[PDB]
Amino acid sequence: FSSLPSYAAFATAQEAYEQAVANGDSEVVLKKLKKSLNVAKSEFD
Amino acid sequence: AVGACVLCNSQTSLRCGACIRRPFLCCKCCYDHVISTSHKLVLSVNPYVCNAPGCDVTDVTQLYLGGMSYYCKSHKPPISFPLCANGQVFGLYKNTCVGSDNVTDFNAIATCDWTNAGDYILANTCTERLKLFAAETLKATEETFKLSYGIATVREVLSDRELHLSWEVGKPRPPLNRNYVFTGYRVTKNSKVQIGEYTFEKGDYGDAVVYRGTTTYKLNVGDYFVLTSHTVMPLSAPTLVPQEHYVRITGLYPTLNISDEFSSNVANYQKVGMQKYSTLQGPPGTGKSHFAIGLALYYPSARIVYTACSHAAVDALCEKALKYLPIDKCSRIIPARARVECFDKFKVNSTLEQYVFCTVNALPETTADIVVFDEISMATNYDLSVVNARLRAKHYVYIGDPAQLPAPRTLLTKGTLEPEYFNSVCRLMKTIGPDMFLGTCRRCPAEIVDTVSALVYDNKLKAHKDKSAQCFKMFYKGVITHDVSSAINRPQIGVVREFLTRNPAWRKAVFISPYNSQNAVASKILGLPTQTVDSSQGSEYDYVIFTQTTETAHSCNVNRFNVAITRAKVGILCIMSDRDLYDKLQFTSL
RNA sequence: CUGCUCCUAGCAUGCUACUACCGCGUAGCAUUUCCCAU
RNA sequence: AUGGGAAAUGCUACGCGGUAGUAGCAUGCUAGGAGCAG
Ligand SMILES: Nc1ncnc2c1ncn2[C@@H]1O[C@H](COP(=O)(O)OP(=O)(O)O)[C@@H](O)[C@H]1O
Ligand SMILES: [Zn+2]
Ligand SMILES: [Zn+2]
Ligand SMILES: [Zn+2]
């Protein structure tokens, strides 16, 4: 399931999540990362 | 349709897609912009798309000439060439593309969100044409934002003048005032026609709203009121005209032995004459609009037109001119809407007059000999070049004060803006100094000038009148809503109502409330001469009532309060909620 | 050739329990912002 | 001298449902190997 739109969107979501976790700016930003992760998992499912 | 570029101003005819205003770009400039930014759409004599219907690629990064049109790689004909040039973009004129590199600022202009003060300050630092384009795109951004405002899914209507308002969920339900423009749309499965130019302000008490439209039915349930946006027109004239020094007078007709207060300012008037223009930088209250009518008295012969930012200032100017200058040579141009009242004694929009007045947004496109503009702080750099384009005279006068509050600029929700960077003129005023300055607040007596010069201003200000002994204060807090519903301090209104009788000449004291809800409810309760600061800008009153509701970045603004107090003449009474702010001034407490 | 049984493997289904996340729904608690001209 | 106060960002608790992963139960079938009886 590598060459799939869900896979690519999840990869971008993970990239943004790790980037913003390294930034460590806001708790709401981290919640946004978690929500993006969760919809990425949802579609990847 | 061909024009010059912007960064390099070479003759070209390319435009960008993602850039909202779609400006003319040369080849190299456009290539740089599309390489840097994410703009992947270029406009020319035709749009740029993969001509093959089985493709929908609009990216300029790859596009292949399919004989006469553009193609993708999967549809590229064999004998065909990609149209991304050797570090440029292929098209109209390439042999006369002069080079210029200042694209990074231009990229940032088409990048930033105008929520950070860095955007606005950087905007007022670039090339003139870049400044005009930035102002234009900012105005367009504001129009787009206000377009996406509340869609009032109302349910009830009270009377022919009064109605009940309810809104949808998700979009910003805008405030209600005569300034805004709304219109309902009959959703009857069809005939979604405009019901008329509908203005709206909140009702007197409770869940009540007063409605007034160009037509006025008895509104139904299923309608909604959506805020539409007006278009923005491009401009060409410079914001600021160049300066030229002279030797003798520039052809103006004097009036010997007319007055006395302005014979001392005759030197200043001649200083204006010896140059193309001049400006005025001084504190409020001290010969600002008054240095104007006497200057007109110096040369009251040419056929002239003036204007002002807001309506109160121009109406006060009309009254002052009637007081000094003959009436039947001056006029005031009114707009078509005219929902906000004006000088309802003078000529009704008589453009054919010798000394004409008007508002900023309703100016004609005629010319004059001299001109003066009001409150550069309240204005942007866009309207400056707008009036430069529509109006072209031989002498220009500008007035303003950096301590005043600037234009709203609501999109800037972060940080404060330095007074010089309010517009180009304010930066020039703070960098090169004034052209002529007057510093002796004449309407307020010495106690007010002492308080303002000691606390916020520099200790340089002075007055001409001694203390009027009408200084009083109040500090107790009161309660507000605390959950949206901009603060309303009702206990203070009740205490004012109970007290006022003891104060004999304060029955007509000008009530002040910047907040619209408090502004309405105060007149609803008693009917004091209600007023807001914004609309007190450039006004003046014998008896004033100021009311602070609560503490907030708005109500704690130093400039707001100091511009509020510069309007005291003989008497005033005002209240706070803040301790150190209550202690800051040097008046009697009570 | 019929009937009975054992064992193994796989599949598939049903049901049960556990774990995670999600959003919803409800309840409680608590805060953060606070608005203006045409 | 009056029984007319929200937008909701944040915390906690409960439930639902979905999704995924884990363990368990029952079954339904298939296939294979083997043994007994007539
Ligand atoms: N030289 C002066 N002599 C008397 N009154 C003056 C003088 N200069 C200004 N004023 C008073 O100031 C009022 C107008 O305010 P102004 O000083 O023009 O500044 P602004 O209008 O921006 O506050 C006028 O009513 C006028 O009476
Ligand atoms: Zn662009
Ligand atoms: Zn160029
Ligand atoms: Zn294609």
Q: Which residues contact B470 (CB under 8 A, 6 or more apart)?
A: B570, B571, B572, B573
Closest-CA residue to B448 (of B430, B426, B429, B463): B463
Residues B391, B463 share a domain: no
Q: Give dist(CA B44, CA B53) in Å, integer.
A: 20
Q: Which residues contact B459 (CB under 8 A, 6 or more apart)?
A: B453
**Closest nucleotide to B537: CA versus each C1':** C37
Report how far apart, in Å, the C-alpha atoms of B329 and of each of B259, B318, B346, B350, B354 are: 19, 11, 11, 10, 5
Return the SS3 of B519.
helix
B170 touches strand D (CB under 7 A): no
Q: Which residues pair with B332 in a beta bridge?
A: B348, B357
> Which nucleotides of chain D are near protein (any atom < 7 Å from a CB)?
4-11, 19-20
- Longest CA pairwise span in chain A (Å): 33
Token pair 């070049």 is found at: B385
- For the annotated binding site of B for Zn(2+), the residues are 5, 8, 16, 19, 26, 29, 33, 39, 50, 55, 72, 75
Residues B483, B411 share a domain: no
B171 touches strand D (CB under 7 A): no
What value, to the nearest 5°, has the Cα angle with vertex B123 and ends B120 and B127? 165
Give B51 Cα–ligand 4 centroid separation in angstroms: 7
**Measured CA B168 to C1' C22 distance, in angstroms:** 27
Residues B400, B485 share a domain: no
**Measured CA B154 to C1' D12 distance, in angstroms:** 37
| Protein residue closest via CA to atom 9 of ligand 1 | B287
Say which CATH number the domain at B421 has.
3.40.50.300
| Protein residue closest via CA to atom 26 of ligand 1 | B290
Q: Where are the alpha helices (DSSP H) in B484-578?
A: 490-499, 516-525, 558-565
Element (H, E) at B137: helix B128-147
The residue type at B351: T
A27 touches strand D (CB under 7 A): yes
- For the annotated binding site of B, the residues are 5, 8, 16, 19, 26, 29, 33, 39, 50, 55, 72, 75, 282-289
Q: Which residues pair with B163 in a beta bridge?
A: B209
DSSP state of A40: H
**Closest nucleotide to B174: CA versus each C1':** C35
A1 touches strand D (CB under 7 A): no
Q: Which residues pair with B69 in a beta bridge?
A: B66
Q: Is the dihedral of CA B247, B252, B258, B260 positive or negative?
A: negative
**Measured CA A41 to C1' D20 distance, in angstroms:** 9
Residues B452, B433 share a domain: no
Whether ligand 1 lies within 6 angstroms of the CB of B283 is answered as: no
Residues B552, B422 share a domain: no
Q: Where are the alpha helices (DSSP H) in B1-75?
A: 27-36
Length of chain B: 590
Resolution (angstroms) equals 3.4
Give B49 Cα–ligand 4 centroid separation in angstroms: 8
Q: Which residues contact B482 (CB under 8 A, 6 or more apart)?
A: none
For helices A5-23 and A27-44, give the axis angle rounded to 10 degrees: 160
Residues B356, B264 share a domain: yes
Give B101 Cα–ligand 3 centroid separation in angstroms: 9
**Closest nucleotide to B553: CA versus each C1':** C34
Instruction: Tell me the ligand closest to B539's alpha carbon.
Output: 1
Q: Which residues contact A3 (CB under 8 A, 6 or more apart)?
A: none
Tell me if B93 sits within 8 A of B12, measured CB to CB.
Answer: yes
B585 CB burial (10 A radius; 0-12, 13-18, 19+): buried
Whether ligand 1 lies within 6 angstroms of the CB of B285 is answered as: yes
Tell me if B532 sits within 8 A of B435, measured CB to CB.
Answer: no
User: CB within 7 A of strand C: which residues qualify?
Assistant: A 34-35, 38, 41-42; B 175, 177, 179-181, 310-311, 335, 337, 340, 361, 407-408, 410, 480, 482-484, 486-487, 514-517, 532-535, 550-555
Residues B541, B580 share a domain: yes
Q: Give dist(CA B300, CA B585) in Å, integer.
A: 43
- Ligand 1: atom nearest CA of B289 is 18
Instruction: Tell me the ligand closest to B264's alpha carbon.
Output: 1
Name the closest residue (CA) to the C1' of nucleotide C20.
A38
Q: How was this structure determined?
A: cryo-EM
Residues B483, B385 share a domain: no
**Measured CA B182 to C1' D6 distance, in angstroms:** 26
Residues B463, B410 share a domain: no
Give B76 Cα–ligand 4 centroid separation in angstroms: 8
| Protein residue closest via CA to atom 15 of ligand 1 | B285
Return the SS3 of B16.
strand
Residues B491, B512 share a domain: yes
Query: Best of B262, B442, B464 to mutate for ligand 1, by most ligand atoms within 8 A of CB?
Result: B442
Closest-CA residue to B95 (of B47, B6, B26, B5): B26
Residues B469, B321 share a domain: no
Give A45 Cα–ligand 2 centroid separation in angstroms: 38
Q: What are the phi and psi torsion angles at B357 (to 5°)?
A: -130, 160
B498 touches strand D (CB under 7 A): no
Give B59 Cα–ligand 3 centroid separation in angstroms: 20
Taking CB atoms within 8 Å and a gap of at least 24, the contacts of B134-138 are B134/B109, B135/B380, B135/B381, B135/B382, B135/B385, B136/B21, B136/B232, B136/B234, B136/B235, B136/B382, B137/B19, B137/B20, B137/B21, B137/B109, B137/B110, B138/B114, B138/B382, B138/B411
Give B22 Cα–ligand 3 centroid separation in angstroms: 14
Residues B400, B279 share a domain: yes
Domain carrying residue B264: 260-437
